[PDB]
Structure formats: structure tokens, C-alpha cells
Design an enzyme around this catalytic site. Structure first.
Site, PDB file in Angstrom:
ATOM      1  N   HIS A   1      43.630  42.535  37.527  1.00 47.79           N
ATOM      2  CA  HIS A   1      42.833  42.310  38.571  1.00 47.79           C
ATOM      3  C   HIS A   1      42.069  43.393  40.074  1.00 47.79           C
ATOM      4  O   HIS A   1      42.860  43.826  40.542  1.00 47.79           O
ATOM      5  CB  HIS A   1      42.728  40.859  38.668  1.00 47.79           C
TER       6      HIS A   1
ATOM      7  N   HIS B   1      39.113  42.965  43.103  1.00 48.32           N
ATOM      8  CA  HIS B   1      38.441  42.092  43.860  1.00 48.32           C
ATOM      9  C   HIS B   1      37.528  42.697  44.296  1.00 48.32           C
ATOM     10  O   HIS B   1      37.557  44.163  44.510  1.00 48.32           O
ATOM     11  CB  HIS B   1      38.775  41.286  45.755  1.00 48.32           C
TER      12      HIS B   1
ATOM     13  N   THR C   1      46.937  35.721  46.502  1.00 48.77           N
ATOM     14  CA  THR C   1      45.749  35.702  47.841  1.00 48.77           C
ATOM     15  C   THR C   1      44.954  35.203  47.369  1.00 48.77           C
ATOM     16  O   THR C   1      43.836  34.494  47.702  1.00 48.77           O
ATOM     17  CB  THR C   1      44.453  37.220  47.824  1.00 48.77           C
TER      18      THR C   1
END
Ligand SMILES: [Zn+2]
EC number: 4.2.1.1
Length: 256
Positions: free
Chosen positions: A91, A93, A195
């Protein structure tokens, strides 16, 4: 619930997840003059030729590409690791602007996005057991800078249309993660955590020194995603990054 807004943002996570204020939280700023060259550190071993992607899903705080981790098809070994780590999902960010978006920073420089390849230690048997251990996961962190297009990324860019809102998923087979790696495997490593909540401190971070570049138009499509579910007021999925956390005497080591 937690998110990235002013009312449920990172500054608020500690209330529901006290570990947020722990001793090995991630991300962190990578101070390049202070990182220590460690010659005992082995080269990373990325074996992704047999990777099997299955699907892509918008989980409300990003979009994950999921892989079949029932066998040792796509694994990471070497570097500072012990044993075999199987790829489960990747994924990103990203920011609302090209000037921000990464979680990790280098000498306080922020990149447009950050890619995380998540792997779990096979001696624990399942991902759920691995998150409860200090050496449970290994996350390969790759920075994205805006420049030329990244060919290997376009297949992902093209399906985002399909998983626009929270809870949507689409078949996503035969995607080869090899097209997302930079040329060089030089890295920095330190012990840290997830995170996003639950912020468990079970991660060995492997952050690559070389960024991959993507086009302005490729990053633009990431910003068209929604945090909301279908039929809800639209909220662009932007700035889904947690700011740097205190290093607190951990040491960052460098392979170069
Ligand atoms: Zn991540």
C-alpha cells in the site's frame, strides 16, 4: 474512529492506542550523518518471481494490493533479517501536494509518496501471530518522487476507478511487484512499528535509499480516492501519512 482528519488524526490516536507514545514508534526522520554504516549487514534478498497478487481493496485509509501468502511464493530474506518473510500486501501513503506524502523523511526531506511492502515472519505461522512478536514483520519502504512515469505502476493506477470508496475491492491478478523496485537495494534499517493503529512494535524497517519516480498524472489518480464509503459525503483520500516520531536512542544502521 481513527483517521487523518483534525478530529481523529494522528495527534489523537494515543487515546485509543496508548502504544502511540511507545519507545519504538514509526515513522522517523533518517538523519544521514548520524546513521551508522554496518558492514556485518548482508544484502537484501528479494525473491518475487513467483508472486501471486489476488486483489486490490480500498480499506478506508488506503488501497492494499493483497497477495497469496499461503506458501513461500514471494519472500524477503537477508539484510538484517533472520529467516523468511512472506509478502502479504503493499500500500502507499501520499499527500495532497507533491511536497509531502511520505512517512519517513531523509534529513527532514519529505517525498510525494511512500510505498510499503509488508512481510511476515513465517516461523510464526500466520500474520495475526507475527504482529505480536518483536521480529514479526519486515516492511520494505520505498520513496516516490514526481518525475517520469513508472511503467510498472500504471496497472495499479488504472484500477483505482473501481475501488473509489471504502469497502470496495476488485480482482487484481498477475501484478508483478518487481516493477516497483528501484535499481539499487542500498538501505537503512531500524526497529520500529506499524504506522497505523494498532501501532504494534513488531516491525523491522528496511527503507531503500533510492526513490522511484512517478508522473504527476500517476500521483493525481491516487488523490481521486475517497476515505468515505459509497453514498456518503465525499472526502478525498489525501495526506494519509503519520508524521515522524521520536527516535529515542534507537540506532539507524546503513548498508552503505
Ligand atoms: Zn504503510
Amino acid at each position: 474512529h481513527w483517521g487523518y482528519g483534525k478530529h481523529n488524526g494522528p495527534e489523537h490516536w494515543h487515546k485509543d492506542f496508548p502504544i502511540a507514545k511507545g519507545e519504538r514508534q514509526s515513522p522517523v526522520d533518517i538523519d544521514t550523518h548520524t546513521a551508522k554504516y554496518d558492514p556485518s549487514l548482508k544484502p537484501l534478498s528479494v525473491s518475487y518471481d513467483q508472486a501471486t497478487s489476488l486483489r486490490i481493496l480500498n480499506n478506508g485509509h488506503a488501497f492494499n494490493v493483497e497477495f497469496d501468502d499461503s506458501q513461500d511464493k514471494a519472500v524477503l530474506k537477508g539484510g538484517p533479517l533472520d529467516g523468511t518473510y512472506r509478502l502479504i500486501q503493499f500500500h502507499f501513503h501520499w499527500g495532497s501536494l507533491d511536497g509531502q506524502g511520505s512517512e519517513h523523511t531523509v534529513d527532514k526531506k519529505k517525498y510525494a509518496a511512500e510505498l510499503h511492502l509488508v512481510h511476515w515472519n513465517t516461523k510464526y505461522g500466520d500474520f495475526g501471530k507475527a504482529v505480536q512478536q518483536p521480529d514479526g514483520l519486515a516492511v520494505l519502504g520505498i520513496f516516490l518522487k514526481v518525475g517520469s512515469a513508472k511503467p510498472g505502476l500504471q496497472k495499479v493506477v488504472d484500477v483505482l476507478d473501481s475501488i473509489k470508496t471504502k469497502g470496495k475491492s476488485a480482482d487484481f491478478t498477475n501484478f508483478d511487484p518487481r516493477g516497483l523496485l528501484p535499481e539499487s537495494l542500498d538501505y537503512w534499517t531500524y526497529p520500529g512499528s506499524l504506522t497505523t493503529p494498532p501501532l504494534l512494535e513488531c516491525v523491522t524497517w528496511i527503507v531503500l535509499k533510492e526513490p522511484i519516480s512517478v508522473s504527476s498524472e500517476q500521483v493525481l489518480k491516487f488523490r481521486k480516492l475517497n476515505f468515505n464509503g459509497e453514498g456518503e459525503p465525499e472526502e478525498l483520500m489525501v495526506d494519509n501519512w503519520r508524521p515522524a516520531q521520536p527516535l529515542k536512542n534507537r540506532q539507524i544502521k546503513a548498508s552503505f
